[PDB]
Write a protein that holds these residues in place. Structure first.
Motif, PDB file in Angstrom:
ATOM      1  N   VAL A 230      40.337  21.535  64.257  1.00  0.00           N
ATOM      2  CA  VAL A 230      41.270  20.734  65.106  1.00  0.00           C
ATOM      3  C   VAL A 230      42.332  20.133  63.835  1.00  0.00           C
ATOM      4  O   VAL A 230      42.126  19.424  63.130  1.00  0.00           O
ATOM      5  CB  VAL A 230      40.696  19.265  65.964  1.00  0.00           C
ATOM      6  N   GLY A 231      43.630  20.472  63.793  1.00  0.00           N
ATOM      7  CA  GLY A 231      44.679  20.074  63.127  1.00  0.00           C
ATOM      8  C   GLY A 231      45.563  19.330  63.842  1.00  0.00           C
ATOM      9  O   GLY A 231      45.924  18.145  63.863  1.00  0.00           O
ATOM     10  N   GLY A 267      41.995  14.847  56.791  1.00  0.00           N
ATOM     11  CA  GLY A 267      43.137  14.824  58.006  1.00  0.00           C
ATOM     12  C   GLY A 267      42.174  14.440  59.215  1.00  0.00           C
ATOM     13  O   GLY A 267      42.109  15.302  60.193  1.00  0.00           O
ATOM     14  N   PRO A 269      42.331  11.927  61.755  1.00  0.00           N
ATOM     15  CA  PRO A 269      42.633  10.719  62.749  1.00  0.00           C
ATOM     16  C   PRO A 269      41.701  10.498  63.902  1.00  0.00           C
ATOM     17  O   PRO A 269      41.874   9.311  64.532  1.00  0.00           O
ATOM     18  CB  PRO A 269      44.154  11.119  63.237  1.00  0.00           C
ATOM     19  N   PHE A 305      47.436  17.586  58.841  1.00  0.00           N
ATOM     20  CA  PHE A 305      48.308  16.761  59.823  1.00  0.00           C
ATOM     21  C   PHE A 305      47.612  15.564  60.312  1.00  0.00           C
ATOM     22  O   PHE A 305      46.444  15.412  60.951  1.00  0.00           O
ATOM     23  CB  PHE A 305      48.715  17.599  61.143  1.00  0.00           C
ATOM     24  N   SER A 307      47.670  13.303  62.961  1.00  0.00           N
ATOM     25  CA  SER A 307      47.412  12.897  64.226  1.00  0.00           C
ATOM     26  C   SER A 307      46.908  14.079  64.912  1.00  0.00           C
ATOM     27  O   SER A 307      46.464  14.921  64.117  1.00  0.00           O
ATOM     28  CB  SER A 307      48.773  12.359  64.919  1.00  0.00           C
ATOM     29  N   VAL A 308      46.616  13.950  66.319  1.00  0.00           N
ATOM     30  CA  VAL A 308      46.002  15.126  67.027  1.00  0.00           C
ATOM     31  C   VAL A 308      46.422  14.949  68.405  1.00  0.00           C
ATOM     32  O   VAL A 308      46.876  13.680  68.835  1.00  0.00           O
ATOM     33  CB  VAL A 308      44.562  14.719  66.832  1.00  0.00           C
TER      34      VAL A 308
HETATM   35 NA    NA Z   1      45.057  16.344  62.627  1.00  0.00          NA
END
Ligand code: NA
Ligand SMILES: Cc1ncc(COP(=O)(O)O)c(CN[C@H](CNc2ccccc2O)C(=O)O)c1O
Ligand SMILES: Cc1ncc(COP(=O)(O)O)c(CN[C@H](CNc2ccccc2O)C(=O)O)c1O
Ligand SMILES: O=C(NCCOP(=O)(O)O)c1ccc(OC(F)(F)F)cc1
Ligand SMILES: O=C(NCCOP(=O)(O)O)c1ccc(OC(F)(F)F)cc1
Ligand code: NA
Ligand code: NA
Ligand code: NA
Ligand code: NA
Ligand code: NA
Lengths: 395, 268, 395, 268
Positions: A230-231, A267, A269, A305, A307-308
């Motif tokens: 999950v990015g 990464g 979040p 990244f 956020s998600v």
């Molecule tokens: Na992310």
């Protein structure tokens, strides 16, 4: 006013400057119209099958589970044309772009797989494609920069901020706010303002749909769990979606742990950030105490990244899906293990999911478990990065 | 307070438009920012629009991105911006002060607490760049509860529903957006759309100020002739800060000269 | 004595030192036994489907044939796991190796696609793999060297002779003559001593079999012609085989013209060489007047081989198949055209076949023709080579 | 002629084995090659095995590959090899001369014409490295028609069918291959397999010479004790050429010393 719900519990929405709201509403309307349009569905289906190569294989690992009670399948999105799952929803969004009479495409990319997918789709369907890519990623995912330019796409390096994915995101959105009359923003993950999280899910859900059909055929039952990295959230929600109502099936998403959660260089979040508003959505964000967005870190550009997507934040909050993290080193081990023992070179992003599956097996080797990992991409883009690291070690 | 109403009442009596400079708070540092603001006021600024440095300013072009970067390089935080706002209000009791915020900075540790904080320091309005009217409810409600005017964008692609909502929801002034895109001085905004100006007035909206790409006195006078109540200039002013970083004295003189010419153009 | 015919008319045979004859006879016997063994067939079929991703797509070109009466399909071997058709027969030969109790694999490679296929097969099936690769090819096809080493294969650069494919072939054969008791020689094309040309054809024929089924389903008839590139002959015979008895279907093989046939820097022995004995077979060879083997040349490493499989020499002699040549520059144009107009990055080898198809169309644009090109590989291995060339031009 | 029969008749009378050196024709150049060959003969060579440089010698390890490369660097062609063969025969009328050929050089412009050419220059045998007995028909038939002995390998993995065929097809001598692999001095061949020696004799095959990796006098005497009629050494001799490229005088002396010691070991 919208046709569909922009929220998943508290998460989601349409936090963009007012100028962009009509574009989003237009896009939502075209999506809703396209979904009930047999012509559109048939065109999308034909591209998926005859151009991209769906359905993708579901491969049972022959060696890496030896001596344990884990049966592990890999959903082979690495075999999709372009080399990752990103190709699925790009094809659908490209058809939407043409449906709305847009002649240009803007896309951000980090791993370069979304950029390659956008470029190849724009080459086929007659669109003019420009791609924003963080300058750091231009270097560590260079093979995809070459591929994108070879297919006639303009690749624009972004040197601001961390020079990675969120900075490409920022530039893509700034560009779109001025060019939306002629350009479609082909957002590359299940995040951003509505209707992107919904459209991206719906144009990726064939991953889970095929997986269920395939695992039923081969095993006569559903998996105990499906595991995806999950990015931003697209490959995971694409795998998860058709299983959400099958309550017995664990939904496990894997965020990058970077150098380790404790270092703050990660990464993750969803599990280690807090809800905030950025990039058009209300969602978990890595942020400072006073609300500035933190820079993320991961060895893999595709997960780098901070956020998600909001549907993952929601699924986690109600406890329907569980989210974990896997570090650079754990991902590297899984990368090496798949290369040497199954003869598949996985993306470093996908390697994070595989790594977590290998942990589930190793931690409890007599636990009966039937697992599917979404092998979201092939690792061609990563081979030089990984070589340099492994060499710098002494291997 | 009614600092905006009092201002517009007075401008109308003098038959002139408003000129409203924007700068980023704390650019290029706290002390020089405070001096820049005093110079903007001395030169004839009718009100101020002030940005709080945010990490990822998605509505801003390179000029204001670089202003944010300069402020951060000087260690500027929202807490320090509120410290400056208190000093500003203390020196200038009547001038309307509007903040230009990104949503995360307002939402961060409580929307209500943010607006309470604005009321406490004597800010008059808040425009949240990435909160469309569709998402505005808890923002505008908190604003009104704390006597802050919530300010909304009326974009050039606005329909009748949006006109009615902006007219109903907004206070202080209506931000009449000159063009698509992000902020920037070289991308010049078009003239105010006559149909939006008329509709905003029909629906009793707050007075319209034109903003985005307003960089020259001619554009200011043209906005007012077009029926707007005034104009906002940001990037054009920030460029003067950026150009004269090495010379604070020359920075101030150029700011004064430009704001003066801009303000003069608002006069009948 | 053999179980199967080692010749195709005058061409073929088993011209190896006597020491290697029992190995060849053993291999022929295992192949014959395996072909009638349901267990073997089911294992091979399962690997092809669930591991390699067969059947591969048959893609209709949307743009490159505009304004002509040519309908052009691409058989998508570029979507096979590993990135080329080479994976098909490697899987079959690897199962043969295990059937004969060999624990090691020797393979030559030029494009590195056969080497990658051998490496990935050896990783999956528990074989120790060593690959010989001409040093020139190690450089111009470097991405595959990285992939092979990542999967645990030993890659040995060969600096002798032209430092390309025939020199890797020479080293592979020298090695095998000493190690055949424990190592299987996984020859990577339809050439060499019997039974390799036969085994390689039979383990590639699914290409043509699928193609026929697919084109029948989509068009209701057979193609006017099927077109494949020819370096050693495996992808071409794999495409041709199921169509040999369909006399209406043209079989067109495309040898590399290099800098042009007239320069003598090419790899077109079938049409521009003469019959000779080398690499275990009687076949057309590029050779000097007094019978030394000439060095070939092509921009593409996979076609840079100065002989050709005997079944192609035979099919040509009786006029069942026709063979042409396509130069470096023509191949480069076709490469670029597919990238920019269909969004597919083809191998430079495959680009030679596409180039000839584009000639057939352009030369006679009002001629009704239904063509299939075997898109034998993806061009990832080639993107840096092509970039340097295109840049050195001024593009 | 019966140069081989006459040689073996004589060796048997002296109760000794044959020692047969191999060199590549034209290595390191034509003149020095001719001198090397004279030195091999003067030092006691019973017969010669001579290689014609081929572009792609698949049965040869690095030593003989490099010999081929040296000969090519000197411009050596098969035509020039036949010119040397005439000069050799002219000086040495009785010594058996065998060629070691790759198939393409024999097949190239007519198998019959190649063997006619051998007969014309006075060569006695031809071994075609990459022509197994299975493919040998037009080769051995052409050889016999032109009074050349076709020579075949009896490998260590030989079965009874191959024994019978080698015995039937071959003339001059039977090449008893010491080991798998390609030529080379450091990979030492095993002792002659007793069962092959006995079977070859039972089937009236031509006398067996052991070859591959024979590099020392001890191996020669051991081959003969084992029942072989003699031994062939190639790479070991070529290494002496390679080692002494800078000194033709020292090259010759070392060749002489080595061949002498090798030949002495063949003596009862
Ligand atoms: Na992310
Ligand atoms: C093989 C593979 N597997 C997994 C992932 C993770 O992406 P996801 O969570 O959507 O499934 C990627 C992400 N790839 C990036 C980032 N794409 C990207 C990521 C976050 C925000 C915006 C983005 O365009 C890209 O291709 O641009 C990937 O290439
Ligand atoms: C995508 C693609 N398309 C076509 C070809 C041409 O090979 P083919 O004619 O067999 O179909 C290749 C050949 N590839 C080489 C050469 N392989 C090779 C070539 C000649 C002799 C021996 C070889 O191993 C290799 O992968 O080792 C290829 O990669
Ligand atoms: O006033 C602003 N910037 C300064 C003036 O613009 P410019 O002169 O181009 O720098 C400004 C910037 C953004 C904004 O929100 C939204 F993006 F939605 F419009 C509202 C006002
Ligand atoms: O005599 C030969 N080479 C010189 C002697 O060997 P070495 O001493 O190892 O150099 C020699 C080389 C190859 C050959 O054909 C085949 F490969 F099939 F055996 C026959 C004899
Ligand atoms: Na995901
Ligand atoms: Na927050
Ligand atoms: Na060839
Ligand atoms: Na071929
Ligand atoms: Na020939």
């Amino acid at each position: 006013t919208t046709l569909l719900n922009p929220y998943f519990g508290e998460f989601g929405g349409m936090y963009v400057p007012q100028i962009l709201m009509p574009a989003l509403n237009q896009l939502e309307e075209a999506f809703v119209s396209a979904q009930k349009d047999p012509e559109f569905q048939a065109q999308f289906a034909d591209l998926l099958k005859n151009y991209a190569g769906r359905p993708t294989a579901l491969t049972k690992c022959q060696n890496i589970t030896a001596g344990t009670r884990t049966t592990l399948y890999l959903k082979r999105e690495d075999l999709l044309h372009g080399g990752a799952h990103k190709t699925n929803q790009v094809l659908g969004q490209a058809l939407l772009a043409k449906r709305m009479g847009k002649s240009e495409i803007i896309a951000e990319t980090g791993a370069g797989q979304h950029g390659v997918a956008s470029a190849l789709a724009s080459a086929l369907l007659g669109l003019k494609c420009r791609i924003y890519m963080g300058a750091k990623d231009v270097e560590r995912q260079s093979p995809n920069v070459f591929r994108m330019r070879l297919m006639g796409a303009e690749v624009i390096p972004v040197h601001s901020g961390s020079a990675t994915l969120k900075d490409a995101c920022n530039e893509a959105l700034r560009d779109w706010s001025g060019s939306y009359e002629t350009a479609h923003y082909m957002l590359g993950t299940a995040a951003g303002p509505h209707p992107y999280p919904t459209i991206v899910r719906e144009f990726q859900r064939m991953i889970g749909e095929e997986t269920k059909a395939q695992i039923l055929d081969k095993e006569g039952r559903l998996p105990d769990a499906v595991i995806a990295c999950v990015g931003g959230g697209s490959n995971a929600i694409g795998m998860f979606a058709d299983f959400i109502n099958d309550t017995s099936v664990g939904l496990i998403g894997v965020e990058p742990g970077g150098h380790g959660i404790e270092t703050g260089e990660h990464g993750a979040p969803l599990k280690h950030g807090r809800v905030g508003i950025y990039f058009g959505m209300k969602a978990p964000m890595m942020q400072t105490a006073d609300g500035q967005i933190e820079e993320s870190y991961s060895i893999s550009a595709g997960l780098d990244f901070p956020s998600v997507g909001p549907q993952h934040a929601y699924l986690n909050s109600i406890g329907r899906a569980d989210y974990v993290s896997i570090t650079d080193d754990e991902a590297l081990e899984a990368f090496k293990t798949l290369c040497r023992h199954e003869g598949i070179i996985p993306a470093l992003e996908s390697s994070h999911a595989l790594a977590h599956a290998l942990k589930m097996m190793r931690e409890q080797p007599e636990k009966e478990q039937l697992l599917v990992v979404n092998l979201s991409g092939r690792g061609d883009k990563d081979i030089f990065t990984v070589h340099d690291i492994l060499k710098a070690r002494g291997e | 307070m009614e600092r905006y109403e009092n201002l517009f009442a007075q401008l109308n009596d003098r038959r002139e438009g408003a000129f409203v400079p924007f700068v980023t708070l704390g650019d290029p540092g706290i002390e020089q920012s405070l001096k820049i603001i005093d110079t903007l006021i001395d030169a004839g600024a009718d009100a101020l629009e002030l940005g709080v440095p945010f990490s990822d300013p998605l509505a801003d072009g390179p000029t204001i991105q670089n202003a944010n970067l300069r402020a951060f390089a000087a260690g500027v935080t929202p807490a320090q911006c509120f410290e400056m706002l208190a000093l500003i209000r203390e020196k200038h009791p009547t001038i309307p002060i509007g903040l230009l915020m990104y949503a995360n900075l307002v939402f961060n540790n409580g929307i209500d607490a943010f607006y309470a904080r604005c009321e406490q320091v004597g800010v008059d309005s808040v425009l949240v760049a990435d909160v469309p009217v569709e998402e505005s409810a808890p923002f505008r409600q908190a604003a009104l509860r704390h006597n802050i005017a919530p300010i909304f964008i009326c974009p050039p692609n606005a329909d009748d529903d949006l006109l009615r909502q902006v007219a109903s929801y907004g206070r202080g002034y209506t931000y009449l957006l000159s063009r698509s895109g992000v902020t920037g001085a070289e991308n010049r905004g078009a003239l105010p759309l006559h149909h939006l100006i008329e509709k905003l007035k029909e629906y009793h909206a707050a007075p319209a100020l034109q903003g985005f790409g307003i960089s020259s006195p001619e554009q200011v006078s043209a906005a007012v002739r077009a029926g707007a109540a005034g104009a906002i200039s940001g990037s054009a002013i920030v460029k003067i800060i950026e150009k004269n970083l090495a010379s604070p004295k020359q920075m101030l003189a150029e700011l004064r000269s430009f704001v003066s010419a801009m303000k003069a153009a608002s006069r009948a």
